[PDB]
UniProtKB/Swiss-Prot annotation, chains A, B:
Alphabetized GO MF terms: alginate synthase activity; bile acid transmembrane transporter activity; cyclic-di-GMP binding; long-chain fatty acid-CoA ligase activity
Function: Required for alginate biosynthesis.
Full protein stretch here: 14 to 122 of 389
GO BP terms: alginic acid biosynthetic process; bile acid and bile salt transport; single-species biofilm formation; xenobiotic detoxification by transmembrane export across the plasma membrane
Species annotation: Pseudomonas aeruginosa (strain ATCC 15692 / DSM 22644 / CIP 104116 / JCM 14847 / LMG 12228 / 1C / PRS 101 / PAO1)
Family the entry assigns: Belongs to the Alg44 family.
Identification of the protein by name: Mannuronan synthase
Keywords: Alginate biosynthesis, Glycosyltransferase, Periplasm, Transferase
Record's keyword annotation contains Phosphoprotein: no
Superkingdom of source: Bacteria
Residues passing through the membrane, by range: none
Gene, per the UniProt record: alg44
GO cellular component, as recorded: Gram-negative-bacterium-type cell wall; periplasmic space; plasma membrane
Length: 109, 109
């Protein structure tokens, strides 16, 4: 097994992006980390390697955070339709902020 | 002069609350800190000591943050209509998160 570079957490979170068939997607996140996220595809075709841009929202410490993110699909389980994604081109302070907030959430667990 | 307990910054930020005359307010923030904020009243009556609840939005490191805050008016300059406010009842992790983000903004300056 591989070490995950960023700890993952399950919290209230959502991704909104425009997908392949020009069909807007609104998906609850299965989990989130400073490196990426997962969600259940339940819809249009999606492939490993696909690049999307969207607005991600999540809540930590009663604060709602949202940012525009680009992501790359890293895996698609054709069975469960679980889609694993990696953020692309996040700025240093942005990644740092994500890490801080997720760590703060973890601290609460 | 008095030392400010929390550093203040000028960033894109907004407060939305329901004011005295039941008149909804949407005001850009003059500045923000982990302790409170200021805005120009330009409208209905408002007094030192007034308590309001609203949704505050601000942007740091390309991330948009919003939270429901209760605030107490600490000062009202009847001339410039500058209103200075103090957050009430923020949770420890919430204050810590605010301090972190504002410090991160300051670091960028
Ligand atoms: N390609 C890919 N798929 C991912 C990734 N994260 C989650 N998944 C998929 O999501 C399933 C379940 O993830 P899990 O709940 O965290 O639960 C996982 C996890 O807790 C653990 N696990 C398995 N392999 C690894 C690993 O290489 N590293 C770590 N840290 N945990 C693993 O075993 C459970 C299931 O393993 P899987 O059969 O692989 O089944 C995984 C896998 O199909 C990922 O970064 N890349
Ligand atoms: N929150 C979240 N982020 C995701 C997910 N899928 C991909 N990412 C993000 O994209 C990076 C690369 O994913 P990977 O190519 O599948 O490459 C993964 C994968 O090969 C493996 N891995 C980690 N966990 C599992 C697992 O539960 N099952 C399996 N089969 N592999 C895993 O370890 C590699 C690196 O893991 P990371 O360091 O965490 O790095 C991940 C992670 O930052 C996801 O389901 N949830
Ligand atoms: N009651 C109250 N009013 C506030 C507060 N913060 C800002 N104001 C009001 O906003 C005006 C300008 O604030 P400033 O731009 O930061 O610019 C300020 C600030 O840079 C500085 N200053 C004056 N007094 C103090 C002080 O006691 N502590 C600090 N740290 N700075 C002060 O002088 C400028 C103007 O002084 P002011 O005449 O008082 O005029 C102040 C004052 O009327 C506050 O925490 N409480
Ligand atoms: N971002 C922001 N927060 C505000 C403002 N007004 C009040 N607050 C928040 O509410 C606390 C108390 O404000 P104060 O009663 O006016 O009590 C103030 C006030 O008496 C004085 N003070 C600070 N700056 C100034 C200033 O520029 N001018 C004057 N006249 N007094 C100041 O120092 C006391 C404590 O300052 P703080 O520690 O900063 O603590 C402030 C601050 O956390 C504001 O305009 N902007």
């Amino acid at each position: 097994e591989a070490q995950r570079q960023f700890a993952r957490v399950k919290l209230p979170a959502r991704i909104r992006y425009i997908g392949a068939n020009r069909e807007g997607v609104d998906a609850r996140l299965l989990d989130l980390s400073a490196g990426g996220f997962a969600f259940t595809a339940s819809g249009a075709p999606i492939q490993p390697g696909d690049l999307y841009k969207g607005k991600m929202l999540f809540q930590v410490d009663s604060i709602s955070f949202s940012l525009e993110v680009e992501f790359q699909v890293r895996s698609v389980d054709p069975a469960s339709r679980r889609v694993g994604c990696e953020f692309q081109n996040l700025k240093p302070r942005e990644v740092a902020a994500l890490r801080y907030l997720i760590t703060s959430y973890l601290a609460g667990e």
